[PDB]
Write a protein that binds this ligand. Sequence first.
Ligand SMILES: *[C@@](C)(CO)[C@](*)(O)[C@H](CC(C)C)NC(=O)[C@H](Cc1ccccc1)NC(=O)[C@H](CC(C)C)NC(=O)[C@H](CCc1ccccc1)NC(=O)CN1CCOCC1
Ligand SMILES: *[C@](O)([C@H](C)CO)[C@H](CC(C)C)NC(=O)[C@H](Cc1ccccc1)NC(=O)[C@H](CC(C)C)NC(=O)[C@H](CCc1ccccc1)NC(=O)CN1CCOCC1
Ligand SMILES: CC(C)C[C@H](NC(=O)[C@H](CCc1ccccc1)NC(=O)CN1CCOCC1)C(=O)N[C@@H](Cc1ccccc1)C(=O)N[C@@H](CC(C)C)[C@@H](O)[C@H](C)CO
Ligand SMILES: CC(C)C[C@H](NC(=O)[C@H](CCc1ccccc1)NC(=O)CN1CCOCC1)C(=O)N[C@@H](Cc1ccccc1)C(=O)N[C@@H](CC(C)C)[C@@H](O)[C@H](C)CO
Lengths: 217, 201, 213, 199, 204, 220, 202, 202, 122
Amino acid sequence: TQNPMVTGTSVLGVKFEGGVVIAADMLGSYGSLARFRNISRIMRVNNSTMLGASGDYADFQYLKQVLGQMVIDEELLGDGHSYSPRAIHSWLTRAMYSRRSKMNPLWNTMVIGGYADGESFLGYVDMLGVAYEAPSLATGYGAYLAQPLLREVLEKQPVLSQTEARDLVERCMRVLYYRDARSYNRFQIATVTEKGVEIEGPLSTETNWDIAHMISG
Amino acid sequence: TTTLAFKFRHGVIVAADSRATAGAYIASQTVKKVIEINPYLLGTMAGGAADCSFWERLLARQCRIYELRNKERISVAAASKLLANMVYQYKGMGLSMGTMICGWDKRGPGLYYVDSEGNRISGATFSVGSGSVYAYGVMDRGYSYDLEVEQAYDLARRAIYQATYRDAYSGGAVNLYHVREDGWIRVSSDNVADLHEKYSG
Amino acid sequence: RFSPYVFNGGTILAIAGEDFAIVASDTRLSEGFSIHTRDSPKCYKLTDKTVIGCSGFHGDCLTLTKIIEARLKMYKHSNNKAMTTGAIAAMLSTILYSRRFFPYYVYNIIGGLDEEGKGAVYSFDPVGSYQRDSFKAGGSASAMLQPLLDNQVGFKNMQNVEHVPLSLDRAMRLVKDVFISAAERDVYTGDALRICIVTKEGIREETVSLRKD
Amino acid sequence: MEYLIGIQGPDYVLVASDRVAASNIVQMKDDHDKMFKMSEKILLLCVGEAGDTVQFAEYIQKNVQLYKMRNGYELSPTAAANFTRRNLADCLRSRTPYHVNLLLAGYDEHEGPALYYMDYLAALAKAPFAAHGYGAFLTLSILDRYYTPTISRERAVELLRKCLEELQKRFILNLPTFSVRIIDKNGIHDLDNISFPKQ
Amino acid sequence: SIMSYNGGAVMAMKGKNCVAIAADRRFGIQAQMVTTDFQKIFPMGDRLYIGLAGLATDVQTVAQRLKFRLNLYELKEGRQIKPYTLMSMVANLLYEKRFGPYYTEPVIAGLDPKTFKPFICSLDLIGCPMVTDDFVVSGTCAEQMYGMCESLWEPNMDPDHLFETISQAMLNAVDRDAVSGMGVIVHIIEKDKITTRTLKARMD
Amino acid sequence: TTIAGVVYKDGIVLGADTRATEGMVVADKNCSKIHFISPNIYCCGAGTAADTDMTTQLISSNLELHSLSTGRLPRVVTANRMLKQMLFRYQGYIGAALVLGGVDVTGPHLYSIYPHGSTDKLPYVTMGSGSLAAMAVFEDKFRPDMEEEEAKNLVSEAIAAGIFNDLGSGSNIDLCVISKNKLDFLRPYTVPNKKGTRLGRYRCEKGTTAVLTEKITPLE
Amino acid sequence: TTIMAVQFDGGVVLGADSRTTTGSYIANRVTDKLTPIHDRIFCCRSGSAADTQAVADAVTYQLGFHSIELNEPPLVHTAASLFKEMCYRYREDLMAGIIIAGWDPQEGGQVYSVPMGGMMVRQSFAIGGSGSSYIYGYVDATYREGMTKEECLQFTANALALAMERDGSSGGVIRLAAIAESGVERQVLLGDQIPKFAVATL
Amino acid sequence: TTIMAVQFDGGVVLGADSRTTTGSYIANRVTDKLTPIHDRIFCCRSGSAADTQAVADAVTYQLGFHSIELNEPPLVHTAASLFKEMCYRYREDLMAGIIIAGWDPQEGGQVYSVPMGGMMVRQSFAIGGSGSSYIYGYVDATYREGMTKEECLQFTANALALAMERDGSSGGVIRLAAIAESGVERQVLLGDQIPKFAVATL
Amino acid sequence: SYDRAITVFSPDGHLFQVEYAQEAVKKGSTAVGVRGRDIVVLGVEKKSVAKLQDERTVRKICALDDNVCMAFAGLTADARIVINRARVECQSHRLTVEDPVTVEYITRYIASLKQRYTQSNG
Ligand SMILES: *[C@@](C)(CO)[C@](*)(O)[C@H](CC(C)C)NC(=O)[C@H](Cc1ccccc1)NC(=O)[C@H](CC(C)C)NC(=O)[C@H](CCc1ccccc1)NC(=O)CN1CCOCC1
Ligand SMILES: *[C@](O)([C@H](C)CO)[C@H](CC(C)C)NC(=O)[C@H](Cc1ccccc1)NC(=O)[C@H](CC(C)C)NC(=O)[C@H](CCc1ccccc1)NC(=O)CN1CCOCC1
Ligand SMILES: CC(C)C[C@H](NC(=O)[C@H](CCc1ccccc1)NC(=O)CN1CCOCC1)C(=O)N[C@@H](Cc1ccccc1)C(=O)N[C@@H](CC(C)C)[C@@H](O)[C@H](C)CO
Ligand SMILES: CC(C)C[C@H](NC(=O)[C@H](CCc1ccccc1)NC(=O)CN1CCOCC1)C(=O)N[C@@H](Cc1ccccc1)C(=O)N[C@@H](CC(C)C)[C@@H](O)[C@H](C)CO
C-alpha cells in the first residue's frame, strides 16, 4: 500500500495485574469522512494474545486473514505447543519489516496485548518494522494525548488493577474523542486474562460540554 | 583524503593522510589508507571508505586466487585491470572510489590510477583525493626520477603535509610506504602536529 | 511518497581497556518529538567475549541484530568454535556492505576482548567501513561524547601530562559523566544509561539513571 | 577561467595575472589585462563574472580618484580595501550583486607593503600571499612550501615562475602568458611578461 | 548550509570576577583555507568583547555596524556601555534584518564597567538573546563545544583555571571539526588587566 | 514549547517550560517564556523565540503608552486585538504562538493567539510542541471555578506532561498567578529535572595548555 | 466547519458546529462560529479562522461607522455587500466562506451567501463549510416553504447534527441563533440535546 | 457516479444513476451500472469504467466456474470475496468502488461494500460513487430497520434522485433492480418518474 | 519641498537675482588667468592675509582632474559646491566614456549647472 484509503485512528493498550487491556474505536474513515462507523479493529489471535490496529483497514483485514490461518494451522497439530504473544509480536515485526523492505508496506501501526505464563505482554509494531515492549501503548494521536496520561499513572503506580486500567482507558478514550477529529464516540475494549480473550461490545463515552457556556467570562 | 604515489629509480613511493570525515565532523584520524594487497602490491584509498575497503579487499582475494591458480604472482597491470573491470559493472550506481595500484612487476616499477568512473591509466606520478591539487603542486615542484631514497621520502611526506595544511578534509598523520623489488616496506607514520614543528622550525 | 526510514535516536559508546571492554548506551527510543519507550537499551550481547551496540533506525537495528545472531550460530555449527571479536567485525562489515544500495540505517560499535585477552573496540559506518579503536562514540550525541574522550583518554592537547593507562573504574565514571553531560544537550539522549563491562570473568550489566526530559 | 596571484615581500608587493580573455571554447584575447591602477601605489586585481568585473572595478577606481581630487591625497591601501569591501558587501543582498573575486596590492608610506584578498561575498582578509581561480588550487601549496617573510623580489619572481610553470604542467586551461607588476616606494612598475613559447 | 561555508567557532566562559572568550583563527572558503589569522573577536570597549561566528562577510559587517552604533551611543551618552545594553543593541541590529538575516551568531563576554560582575550571552542570527552563568557557544562545531563545556566547566574559577578550561574546550572541540581550527585565540579579561594568548594547536 | 493557561475562581494561572532548542540540541536550559505585557497582563510565548520576544515587547510598549494616555488599567481585549492584528498583517511569517492571560475591570481573560492572527477565548488553553499532552491533562482534570493552589497544581501538571512527553520541552516549570489583587510571578516553581553530579575531576591544572603567544594589557 | 442559515417570516435562524481544527487535531472543540456584526446582523464563518475573524472585525467596523453616519438600522444587504467587497477584492489571499443573515426593517429576515469566489446571492436558506457537502440531499428533501421559526430551528438543528455526525472536521456542540425584530435569542445544543438518528445494526 | 444497495427481509434492492463522463463531457447518459455476476448476484460499479468492467467480467468467470464446481447457488459473500481479492491485490492499479449485493439460500439478502482500499464489510445499506457524498445525511435520517421491499425501492429512488440533482458527475436515468428468491425485477425511472423536490423560490 | 520662483524677470527684462550674484562676484578676490604655448597660468589676488590662517586651507585654485584646473571668484562655499560637483562629473565622464575630459566639456557642465540654478524653483 502506497496510499492508505479507509483508515482507523488511535489504539490504546495497558498492562494490569494478571492481564492486559486494549481499546479502539469502531470507525473507518475515508479521509475526513466517517464512512464506516461500525467495524472492529480488534482481533482475537488465539486465547493468549490479541491485536489492535491503526491505519489502513484493508491491510488490517489481510493481516487478520493471515494470522487467523496461522493460528488454525498450528491448532491442527495439537502437539501441545502454541504461539505465545511474544512469538506473534516477533512474527508481525518480521512481516511488517519485510513489506517495508519491499517498498510495499502494510499501512498499519499495531498493538499486541497478551497474557501467558503469568506475565502480561504489550508490544508495538510499526509499518517500518519498528517494534518494542512497554507497560503502556498508544498509536496515532493517542501517542500525543493518551500516552502522557498513562505514563503519569504508571510512574506513580506501576501495578494497576483491571478496574483501574479500565477506568484509565475510558478516560483516555474520552480525551481522544475530545481532541482527535478522526475519532468516534463508539469504541471497543478487549481484555486478556488467564480466562482468555474477551471483547466487550459497542461502548460510548460520556461527554461534558459545560465549557460551551464560558464564552463571555 | 590526500594520497599520492610516484615511481622513480629505486621503486614506487606511496603516501597518504589518515583523516576520515562524516560531513564536517572528523570521524577518525587513524585510517590506514594504503591497503596491503600483496607483499608486492599496494593500493591507496580515497573517496567512499566502505567502497574502497570492500573492493580493494575483494581485489586482494582475487589476486590471491590468481597466485594459487597460475603458480605465479599477478602483474600490476592485471591487478589494476581486474579492479577496473569489477568496478565498471557498477558504473552510475554511485560508488565513490579513486585508488592507485602500485607495485613491482616483471616490467619493473608499476603505478596505475583506477577510478569508480571507469578510468585506468599508468603514469609516473599521481595524486588522488580532496587535497590532491595541493599535493600535486609541491610534488611536481620537487619530483625527479633521479631522486635519492630519503629525498623521495621527504618529497612525499612534505606534499601530503602541505595538502593537509590547505585541505580542510585532510589531516591526521602522514603515512609513507616504499615499494622495492623484493617487496614493499612501511617507511614512516608521522603525525601532522609533529611534522609542523619539524618543517616550520 | 513513502519513506522506509525513521530516526529513532540513541547514543552509543565503547572503551577498550587492557583487560576489559565497556559498551554503553542510553535506553531512550523516540520518534519525531515523542518517546516510544524509556526502557530500550541499545546493547546486545553476542558472545561471552563480545557485545554490540546498534543505534539509529530501530527496524534495521532489530533486523541486523537477529541476522548477526543467526550467523553466529551458523559459524558455530560450521567451525565448532565461537566467533572471535575481530571475525564478528569483519562479518559485520560484509553484512553491512551487502546492502550498499539500500543500507541499514544503523551506527554500530563492537566492544570486546581479542584472542590475547586484551580489550578492543571496532567502530562501523552504515555501509561496512570499520576500524579498530581504543575508544569510540556513535549515535546522536556522538559529537558531544568524542571530544572529551580525546582529551581524557587520548591525553590530547595536554602538555606535560602522564600517560597512565585507563583503569576500569576511571573508564566507568568517564562513561557515566559523558552520558550525563549528553543528556543535557541531546534531546534524543536520556532516561537511563546501560553499561556492559566485558572481562575474562564475563559480562556485567549496570544501569545508571538519566533525566527524563 | 581566470587566475590571480599576489606575493608580499618586506618592502614590495609582486602581483601577476593571466592574459586570456576567453568565451565558450575559444580564446578571444591573448593580451587581456586584469589589473586596475587606483592610486600611484595601489593595484586592483579583479576577476569573475562578465560585466560585473569591469563595472565594479572601474566604479571603485573612479571613486578612489575622486577621493584623490577632493582631498589632495590618496587613500591608503587599507582604506581602499575596506572601501571596495564596503561597496561589494552592500550590493550583496541587493538587486544587483557583483560576482567578483579580487586582490588588492598596495604600498603605504607608513605601513609599507600590503596584500588583500576578497571573496565574491565580500570577505576581506590580509595575507602574505594569495591567489584566485582554479589555478590557485595548484599554486597555493607551492607558495606555502617556499615562501619566507623576508623573500627578495628576485626570489619572489622566481617563485612566481615556479607557480606559473606548475600551471603549464597540471592545469587543463591554456594560459600561455602573464601580466606581472610590482609595487614599492616608487609606485607601480611593469615587469617583463612571463610567457611560455608554446605556439 | 550557509553558516558552514566559512566555518569557525566562538566560545565564552564565566569565572569568579573574570570572564573568557575564545575563537579559532581559520578563514576558509568551504574546504580551502585562505588565512590563518582571521579575527573573529572584537573589543566593544574596555573589558567588553564580542565574538562572531558564521559567514565571514556578515561577521565583519555586523562587527562594523555595531561599532558604528556603539560609538554613537558612547558619544550621545557620557558613559561606557553595559553588557546587557550591548546585548540588546546587537539583538535589535540583527532583528532589523529579520527577513534577510546576517548569517552570524554573536557571543558577548565582558565585565560590568561600573561593577565588575561577569557577563556572557549569545544570540540568534535574528537576534534572540540568551544569557548564561556558565558558558555559551556558537559555530559549526557547537555540539563538540557543548560536549566539552558540559564536562569541564566549574563555577568559581580563578583567571588561571578558566584559561585552561576554555582552552581545552576550544582545542578539543575544534579538533573534531574539519572547518574549524588552524589555531585558537583566547582573551581572558579581568578588572585589572586583559590577557591575550594564542594556543598551540593542530594546523590540519 | 510546552506552555498553558487556565482560568479559576479568582483569576488566571499561566505556565511554561524553560527549554530552548536549536536543531535537536538544547541551547537554553533556563529560558523565561512568560512575558510581561502590563502589570495586570502576562503572555506566554512559543515558537520562533526572537519573534515571541519582539512581539510581546512591542505590544507591552504600546500598552504602556495606551494606559499612560488613558490613566486606567489596560484591558486584555486590547492586547489581544493588537497581537492578532499585527500577526495577521504578517500572514504567519512571525512565528509567534501565544497564551495571553490577564485580569481586567471586567474580570479574568484568557486567549490563545496563533501566528496567523486567529484567537480563541477559552477557560483553558495550551500551545507549543508539547501542547497535546498538556491539553490532555486539562481535558482530564479541569473543573470550573478552581481554587488558586488547585489551578497551580493543574497547570504545573500540564507543563510537566509537556516536559516529559515532548522532546521539544524540558527543564523547569514557571508559573504566573494573576488575581484581582495579586501578581505571583513564581519563577522556578518546580525543578523536576536535575543534572547528574560529576563522578570525576577533569580539572586541568595550570600549565597543561601549551601557549605560543602571550600579551598582558593593563586597564584601570 | 458546518454553517447554516434559514429564513422564516419575521426573521432568520442561524446554526453552526463548534469544531476548529489544525491538521487532524482539534484546536477548539467549542468555537463560537456565529459572529455579531450589528444589533440584528450576524454572520456564519467558515474557512481560515484568521481570515474570517479579521474580515468580520473589519466589516463590523465599517458597518458601525456607516449606520452611525446614516442614523438608521443597517440593511442586511449592506453588511453582505461589505463582506462581498472584501472577499472578492482579496479572493486570492483569503480562504473564507461566509453566510450573512439577519433582520432589517425594510426587507425583513434575509440570508445571503458569500462563498470563496467573492460572489453574493440571497437564498431562502444557505449551507456552507466542509460538512455542508453531506447534507445537501437532506436539506433538499426536507425544506418546505412557510416554515415557522421553531420549525426552522429544528430544521437547522437536525441538518447540523447529521453533518457533524458524518464530517470529521465538524463536531462538538451546536450553536443556534434566532434573529427577528424582537432581538437575538442564542442557544446551545450539547450532548443529549443534539438530535440522534438510528444507526444500522445487523 | 452514484450507486446504492439496501437490504430488506427476503432480498435486496439495487440502484444507480446512468451518467458516464470523460472530463466534463458525458460519454454515456444511459449507462448500465448494475452488472449481473450470477443468477441472483449483482454488483454496483463506480470509478474507472474499464477497471470495473474488467473486474466484473473476471469475477463472473471465476464465480461461474466455482458454482459449477460446487453444484450449488453461489454465496453472495463469495462473490464479494472474489471482488475483494481482486481489488485489494491490485489496489494500486485499480480505481474501483464496488457494492456487491444479492440473494443467497443460506444467508438471504446481503449487501457488501468494497471501496477503493480493497476492504470488505457487510452493511444494512451501502452507498458509493461521487454523488454518495451528497446523500449521507439524507440516507442517515431516512433509514429505518424493517423496511419493506417497496419501501426500500422508494428509498433508493429518492436518495439517488437527490444525489443526481446535486452531483454533476451523476444524472441521466435511474436504474433499479429487485433481487429475491423469486428472481430479478429490473426497472427504469426516467423523466417525470424520477422523484422531484421543491426548489427554493423567493 | 520649496516650490517658489526665486529668479524671475523684472519689468525692464532683467534677472535681478543673477545680477546680484554677479555683484557678489565683484566683491570676490581678483582671479586672473592666461594661456600660453606650453603653459597656462592662474593667479588669485587678495587672499585676505591674516598670517594666523593656514594658507593651504583657503586656496582659490583647485584641480578638477589631472587634465583640468580651475580658479574662482565670489562666494567660497558655493565655489566648493560647484568644484566638487565638477570633479564628480569629471569622473562620471570617464565612467560612461573611456576617454577623459575636455576643458570645454567640463566648462559647459559648470555653466549649465549655474544656469539651471538661475531657472529652477526654490
Ligand atoms: C471547519 C471546521 C472545517 O475544517 C471550518 O471550515 C473551520 C472554520 C474556522 C472557524 C476555523 N476551518 C478551520 O478550522 C481551518 C482550515 C484550514 C487549515 C489549514 C489551512 C487553511 C485552512 N483550520 C484552522 O483554523 C486552524 C486553527 C488554529 C488557529 C491553528 N489553523 C490551521 O489549520 C493553520 C493554517 C495556516 C496555514 C499554514 C501553512 C500554509 C497555509 C496556511 N495551520 C498551520 O498554519 C500549520 N503550520 C504551523 C504554524 O505555522 C506554519 C504552518
Ligand atoms: C462515475 O464514477 C461517476 C459519474 C463519477 O466519476 C463514473 C461511472 C463509471 C462506472 C463509468 N465514472 C466516470 O465517468 C470516469 C472517471 C475516471 C477518469 C479517469 C480515470 C478513471 C475514472 N470516466 C471514464 O472512465 C472514461 C471512460 C470512457 C471514455 C466513457 N475515461 C476517462 O475518464 C479517461 C481515463 C483514461 C486515462 C487518462 C490518463 C491517465 C490514465 C488513464 N480520462 C480522459 O481524460 C480521457 N480523454 C483524454 C482527455 O480528454 C478527454 C478524453
Ligand atoms: C564514518 C566515516 C569514518 C566514513 C564516512 N562514511 C560516511 O559518511 C557515511 C556513508 C554512508 C553511505 C550511504 C550510502 C552510500 C555511501 C555511503 N555516512 C554517515 O555515516 C552518516 N552521514 C549522514 C549525514 O552526514 C554525512 C554522513 C566516509 O566514508 N567518509 C569519506 C567521504 C565520503 C565519500 C563518499 C560518501 C560520503 C563521504 C572519507 O572519509 N574519504 C576519505 C578517504 C577514505 C578512505 C576515508 C577522503 O576522501 C578524505 C578524507 C576526504 O574526505
Ligand atoms: C537559539 C535559540 C536561543 C532560539 C532558536 N533560534 C534558532 O534556532 C535560529 C533560527 C530561528 C529562525 C530563523 C529564520 C526563520 C525562522 C526562525 N537558528 C539559528 O540561529 C542557527 N541555525 C542556522 C542555520 O541552521 C539552522 C539554525 C529558536 O527560536 N528555537 C525555537 C524553535 C524554532 C522555531 C523555528 C525555527 C527554529 C527553531 C524555540 O526554542 N521554541 C520554543 C519556544 C521559546 C524558545 C520561545 C518552543 O517551541 C519549544 C521549546 C519547542 O521547540
